[PDB]
Amino acid sequence: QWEPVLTEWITAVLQAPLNETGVSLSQLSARNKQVEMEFYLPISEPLIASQLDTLIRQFDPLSAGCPPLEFMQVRGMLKGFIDLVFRHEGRYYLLAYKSNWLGEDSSAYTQQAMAAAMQAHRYDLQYQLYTLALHRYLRHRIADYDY
Amino acid sequence: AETLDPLRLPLQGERLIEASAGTGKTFTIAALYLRLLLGLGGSAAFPRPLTVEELLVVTFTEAATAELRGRIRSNIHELRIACLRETTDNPLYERLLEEIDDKAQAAQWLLLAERQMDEAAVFTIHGFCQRMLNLNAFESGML
Amino acid sequence: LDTNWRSAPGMVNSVNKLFSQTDDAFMFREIPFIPVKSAGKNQALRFVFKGETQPAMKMWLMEGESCGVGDYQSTMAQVCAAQIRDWLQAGQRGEALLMNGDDARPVRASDISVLVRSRQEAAQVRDALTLLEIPSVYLSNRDSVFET
Amino acid sequence: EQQWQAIIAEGLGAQYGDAVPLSLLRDELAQRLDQERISQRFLAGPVNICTLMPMRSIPFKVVCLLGMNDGVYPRQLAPLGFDLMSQKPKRGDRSRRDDDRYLFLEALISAQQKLYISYIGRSIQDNSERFPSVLVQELIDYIGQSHYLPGDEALNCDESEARVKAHLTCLHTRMPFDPQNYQPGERQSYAREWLPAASQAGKA
Amino acid sequence: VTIHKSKGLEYPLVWLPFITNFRVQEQAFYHDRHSFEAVLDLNAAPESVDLAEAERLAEDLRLLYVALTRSVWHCSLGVAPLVRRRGDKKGDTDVHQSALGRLLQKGEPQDAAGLRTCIEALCDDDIAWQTAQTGDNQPWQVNDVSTAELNAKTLQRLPGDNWRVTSYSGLQ
Amino acid sequence: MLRVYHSNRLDVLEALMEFIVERERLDDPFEPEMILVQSTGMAQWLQMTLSQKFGIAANIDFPLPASFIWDMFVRVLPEIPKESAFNKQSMSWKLMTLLPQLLEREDFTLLRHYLTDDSDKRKLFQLSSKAADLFDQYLVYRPDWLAQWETGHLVEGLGEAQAWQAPLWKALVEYTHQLGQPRWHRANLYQRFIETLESATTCPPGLPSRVFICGISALPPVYLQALQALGKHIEIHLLFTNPCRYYWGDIKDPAYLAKLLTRQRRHSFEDRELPLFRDSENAGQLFNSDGEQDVGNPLLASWGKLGRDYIYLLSDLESSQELDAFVDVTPDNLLHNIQSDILELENRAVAGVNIEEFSRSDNKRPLDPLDSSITFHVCHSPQREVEVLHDRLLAMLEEDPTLTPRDI
Numbered sequence A: 001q002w003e004p005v006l007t008e009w010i011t012a013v014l015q016a017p018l019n020e021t022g023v024s025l026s027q028l029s030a031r032n033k034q035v036e037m038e039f040y041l042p043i044s045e046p047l048i049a050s051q052l053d054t055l056i057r058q059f060d061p062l063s064a065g066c067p068p069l070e071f072m073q074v075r076g077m078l079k080g081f082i083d084l085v086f087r088h089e090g091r092y093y094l095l096a097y098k099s100n101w102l103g104e105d106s107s108a109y110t111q112q113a114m115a116a117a118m119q120a121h122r123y124d125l126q127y128q129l130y131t132l133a134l135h136r137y138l139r140h141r142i143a144d145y146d147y
Numbered sequence B: 001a002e003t004l005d006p007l008r009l010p011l012q013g014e015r016l017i018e019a020s021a022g023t024g025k026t027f028t029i030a031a032l033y034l035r036l037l038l039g040l041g042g043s044a045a046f047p048r049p050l051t052v053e054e055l056l057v058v059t060f061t062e063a064a065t066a067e068l069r070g071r072i073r074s075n076i077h078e079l080r081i082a083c084l085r086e087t088t089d090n091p092l093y094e095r096l097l098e099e100i101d102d103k104a105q106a107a108q109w110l111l112l113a114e115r116q117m118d119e120a121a122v123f124t125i126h127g128f129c130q131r132m133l134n135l136n137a138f139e140s141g142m143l
Numbered sequence C: 001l002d003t004n005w006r007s008a009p010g011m012v013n014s015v016n017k018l019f020s021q022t023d024d025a026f027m028f029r030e031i032p033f034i035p036v037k038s039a040g041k042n043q044a045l046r047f048v049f050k051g052e053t054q055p056a057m058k059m060w061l062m063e064g065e066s067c068g069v070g071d072y073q074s075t076m077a078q079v080c081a082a083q084i085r086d087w088l089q090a091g092q093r094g095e096a097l098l099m100n101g102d103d104a105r106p107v108r109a110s111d112i113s114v115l116v117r118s119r120q121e122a123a124q125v126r127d128a129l130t131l132l133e134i135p136s137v138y139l140s141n142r143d144s145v146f147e148t
Numbered sequence D: 001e002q003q004w005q006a007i008i009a010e011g012l013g014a015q016y017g018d019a020v021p022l023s024l025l026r027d028e029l030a031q032r033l034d035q036e037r038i039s040q041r042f043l044a045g046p047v048n049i050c051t052l053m054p055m056r057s058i059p060f061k062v063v064c065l066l067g068m069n070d071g072v073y074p075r076q077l078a079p080l081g082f083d084l085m086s087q088k089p090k091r092g093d094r095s096r097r098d099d100d101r102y103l104f105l106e107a108l109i110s111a112q113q114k115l116y117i118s119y120i121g122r123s124i125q126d127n128s129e130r131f132p133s134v135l136v137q138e139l140i141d142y143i144g145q146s147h148y149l150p151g152d153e154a155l156n157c158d159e160s161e162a163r164v165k166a167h168l169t170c171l172h173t174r175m176p177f178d179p180q181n182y183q184p185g186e187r188q189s190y191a192r193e194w195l196p197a198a199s200q201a202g203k204a
Numbered sequence E: 001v002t003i004h005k006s007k008g009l010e011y012p013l014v015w016l017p018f019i020t021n022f023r024v025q026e027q028a029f030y031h032d033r034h035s036f037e038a039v040l041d042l043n044a045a046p047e048s049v050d051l052a053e054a055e056r057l058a059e060d061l062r063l064l065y066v067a068l069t070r071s072v073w074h075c076s077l078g079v080a081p082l083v084r085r086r087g088d089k090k091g092d093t094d095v096h097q098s099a100l101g102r103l104l105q106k107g108e109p110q111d112a113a114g115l116r117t118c119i120e121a122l123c124d125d126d127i128a129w130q131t132a133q134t135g136d137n138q139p140w141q142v143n144d145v146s147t148a149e150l151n152a153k154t155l156q157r158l159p160g161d162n163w164r165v166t167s168y169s170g171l172q
Numbered sequence F: 001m002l003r004v005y006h007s008n009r010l011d012v013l014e015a016l017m018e019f020i021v022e023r024e025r026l027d028d029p030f031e032p033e034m035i036l037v038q039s040t041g042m043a044q045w046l047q048m049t050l051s052q053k054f055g056i057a058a059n060i061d062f063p064l065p066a067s068f069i070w071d072m073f074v075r076v077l078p079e080i081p082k083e084s085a086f087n088k089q090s091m092s093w094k095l096m097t098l099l100p101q102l103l104e105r106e107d108f109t110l111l112r113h114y115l116t117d118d119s120d121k122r123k124l125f126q127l128s129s130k131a132a133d134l135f136d137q138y139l140v141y142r143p144d145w146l147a148q149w150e151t152g153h154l155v156e157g158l159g160e161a162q163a164w165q166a167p168l169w170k171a172l173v174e175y176t177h178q179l180g181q182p183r184w185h186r187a188n189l190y191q192r193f194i195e196t197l198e199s200a201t202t203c204p205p206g207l208p209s210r211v212f213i214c215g216i217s218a219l220p221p222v223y224l225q226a227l228q229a230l231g232k233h234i235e236i237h238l239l240f241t242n243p244c245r246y247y248w249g250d251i252k253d254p255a256y257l258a259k260l261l262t263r264q265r266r267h268s269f270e271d272r273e274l275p276l277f278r279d280s281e282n283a284g285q286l287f288n289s290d291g292e293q294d295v296g297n298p299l300l301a302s303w304g305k306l307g308r309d310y311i312y313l314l315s316d317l318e319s320s321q322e323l324d325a326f327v328d329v330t331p332d333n334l335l336h337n338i339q340s341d342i343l344e345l346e347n348r349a350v351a352g353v354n355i356e357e358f359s360r361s362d363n364k365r366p367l368d369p370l371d372s373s374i375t376f377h378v379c380h381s382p383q384r385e386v387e388v389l390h391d392r393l394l395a396m397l398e399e400d401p402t403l404t405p406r407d408i
Helices: A003-015 A049-059 A111-121 A124-141 B025-038 B062-085 B091-099 B104-115 B125-135 C009-018 C070-091 C119-130 D002-012 D022-033 D096-110 D134-146 D158-168 D195-199 E046-068 E100-104 E112-121 F010-023 F040-054 F065-076 F088-101 F109-115 F123-141 F143-151 F162-178 F186-198 F221-231 F254-262 F298-303 F305-315 F334-343 F355-359 F382-399
Strands: A033-043 A076-088 A091-095 B056-058 B121-123 C045-048 C057-061 C097-100 C103-106 C112-114 D060-066 D111-120 D169-171 E011-016 E029-031 E038-040 E071-079 E127-131 F002-007 F033-036 F211-214 F236-241 F265-267 F320-325 F374-379
Touching (some): A033 A124, A033 F040, A049 A124, A076 F040, A091 A124, B025 B062, B025 B091, B025 B104, B056 B062, B056 B125, B062 B091, B062 B121, B062 D134, B104 D134, C009 C057, C009 E127, C045 E071, C057 E112, C070 C112, C070 C119, C070 E011, C070 E071, D002 D022, D002 F088, D060 D096, D096 D134, D096 F298, D096 F305, D096 F334, D134 D158, D134 F298, D158 D169, E011 E046, E029 E046, E046 E100, E071 E100, E100 E112, F002 F010, F002 F221, F010 F040, F010 F211, F010 F236, F010 F320, F033 F065, F065 F186, F088 F123, F088 F162, F109 F123, F123 F143, F143 F162, F143 F186, F186 F221, F221 F236, F221 F305, F236 F305, F298 F334, F334 F374, F374 F382
Parallel strands (some): C057 E071, D060 D111, D111 F374, D169 F374, E011 E071, F002 F320, F033 F211, F265 F320
Antiparallel strands (some): A033 A076, A076 A091, C097 C103
């Protein structure tokens, strides 16, 4: 019984553009899209949380609250799975999907509630590692690359 | 009854070896294995030399089969060394070296036996029965 | 196979004397017994005691007219334990030896073995041997570890 | 549910019309549920414990091999008997015995610094001699025929081979609390919990 | 070690204290002397009992041969006039019903003095006999010796650094 | 151009792949880089090494050789579905229906005696699964047998099982012709796929720029004949690990021995021509009458039969470009002695055919007693074996200050 509501909800999601210029998902061809890019990121220094969280809080505006997590020194490789990478008009873009959303039923999911969910679930470090991985991939692939 | 010589046993038809208690039965099995591998005996010999995957050895106890396989492997290596050197310290090995005229082909056959000793057909009774039931499952009717 | 490579020629002659007293000692017509021959390299095997050369087969005849089963088992277990402690008492001083030609070997505790048929008489032998401070292992013990 | 629907989809892809019994589907589901294997933590950084997988050779400093006794390795898979590829072998044919021998060759080549090989040599049940595999036996034969110890410079060929094969073979004790393992020398046990038990300095 | 578990082994000195003990088979399961097939007689016929007791005696003789042919240097046997019958003094003993007494008494029923004369008849340099003397003087001597000095090695540093290949979920 | 990279270890092949990627960059950034592997740990190690070399390792696809071959079948030739109709489970479920229909034939009397005795649909499914596995092996390895079975003609020199295997396969091909399923499979498509690449003038669209084959040491001749036609248009770099630097395979004909002698490898950086055999005048005396080379090393001749067949299959290619990058190992330890004897293709096993070789023993290689490179351990139980292994690994970690447990 959920299917005729599911297909119209899917088309309502796909018709809604997600860009600063208003680019929808239907304008992306098969060569431009890349779904589920798996990357490995190396690190040779001992990853100290105190030396990393201050560097994050120096530039990221969402780190006003969000007390820092505690994790051991990780030296080696880091795995990651980006949901979607797509290019448009000579500009690359990253796209991730979150679908839990248990606590909202009304229209209260504004930018403040989404920013509070980003600060609570700690998706800022994941997005920063995704930007670092995409920067290293575009530097390795395309010569004379500017961020 | 008659006495048994390991280098004069006719390998044709059915033969019944009565090995008494304390006798070298495990040595006699390895000697007959080398005789079947090299094809020795002259008039009482096999019509053709056989490989390692055609010699069937049947012993009930599994540790006895493992010990017999290790002893046959050691005898194969010792006979290969004695055939490459054309000399030995054992009188039965001396008569085995004297029975063959060619040395290079016998050494190559013993090297192939040393390489194919992993695929040797030295099994138990129930193991050989299970292998025959699983291999030719059509005539038997086995899963 | 005519040649026997394991035992001493005295034990071979004892077996060929005991089993060839009458014709068809195994009582079947299709099972014949033949006199076997000993090995030439092992013809000098001698189990020597402190007094003199001990013979190959020594049939310990229990003295008495008629006896039971358990009393006979207990007396023969005590006689066997006395023989074990005598062979181990004289074996640690270089008196009882196993001689191959000129080579000699002292008799340790692993050399003497008691051949039984059931588990009850095996436990009887083990008790009669641990009564005289002699530890004994049971190779034929098939008891489970979950029953202790 | 995914395995059951996959079995039903693979059955209905052929458009099966006859009836199917319950025990066949139960045995098929039991075979398909245990078919999966996990290899996500293969090279995470901890020491790798895995079986020999064919066509996978990775260089390592220390390569250890367990279960190299006869019968266990090489893993022998009997042919079907009615297969025609086993009757007339070609160049590009693949068998499990040759794959295991090539895996042993790749494990010998892929070892950079140290190669460890351990096999069950003595039985724990009846103290019977368990012979190793033919690959390890050919390896120790090539070692004994290609190398010699500096103590016996020119003694013999077979005696030097036996001395090398006895020097390389380290027959360990049956029990961990044996005092032979704690004897100072080439090898010494690192078990500190069994040191006062092996020293025999405790109260009864 | 039992007689079945001693097949193929080797022992320097062998003691057989209960080689004269025998058991009488009650069930009638024998083999035919012509067709060589297993015949199970569910009725209590004495001919089937005798034909099963013949195979039992042959199995006991084979067990006697297996138990005798494992000794290398010395074997010792325990012979006694064992009577399976409940009578104390009937004038005859059942050693002829055993495997050893069929070879000692030559398959003839005899007495304890007859068994002693059959033992003393076949006396050679290898075959001797002695009486069973019950007596104990001292158990054993331990002769212990002091154990050698030993120690255990200690790892000086860590086995490995904190190396781990993780994901975003491992850092959260 | 199909490039073949012979090397002793895998780190040299990883460095060569790094030099190939840094030398030639991809024109399309979103185009995935096809690297053919066999297992998941091989792909994981390749991802970790490429991440350690480049700083990143992304958009690298690791498919199966069969999956990549079917993907190239879909991309090159049209009107082909994404999934193969002839699979193991699909052929098993088809043969479970077709085998009771074929019991009335005279050639299936053995299967009738095997099946009609007692069957609760258990022996039939096992027979269908085993025959479907054999048909999948025939689809991979033996396409000419299936091509002759589709016509209805037998093959001379095979076993008795073909007498029930030839009508069973052909009636399968009609059966998928009877349903709505497509006709095409792996066996009948490879010849048209080879012909359409040689007969074409321009490169077909949708093909990748460069394909890597790393960690794969075993391939069928059908897959190599397809990859040669793929390498005629698109540059494919083949990374194969061989333990010997010289030629250690077999031979086919004396007219092929001269063709192998004319082919010579060249180094990647030194750019010097290096021959295959150590001796060119005595190269004919090494091979036997059947065509097998008398290898001096007994371990390489007794263990690496799969690589011995694979190097003969690689040398049979006409347009193959062979490059050798072998790093020599100084023989100091026992393990390095064994690796040097394997790589240099020499026989150090002293037989002692004469009395002078048997009396003296200083003609062998000296082994130091402190050399703990190769050790053989005898254990009594599986618990005590790994209990000894843990203590020996702790001793190895204590002996070497720079030693990682990941490298163990």
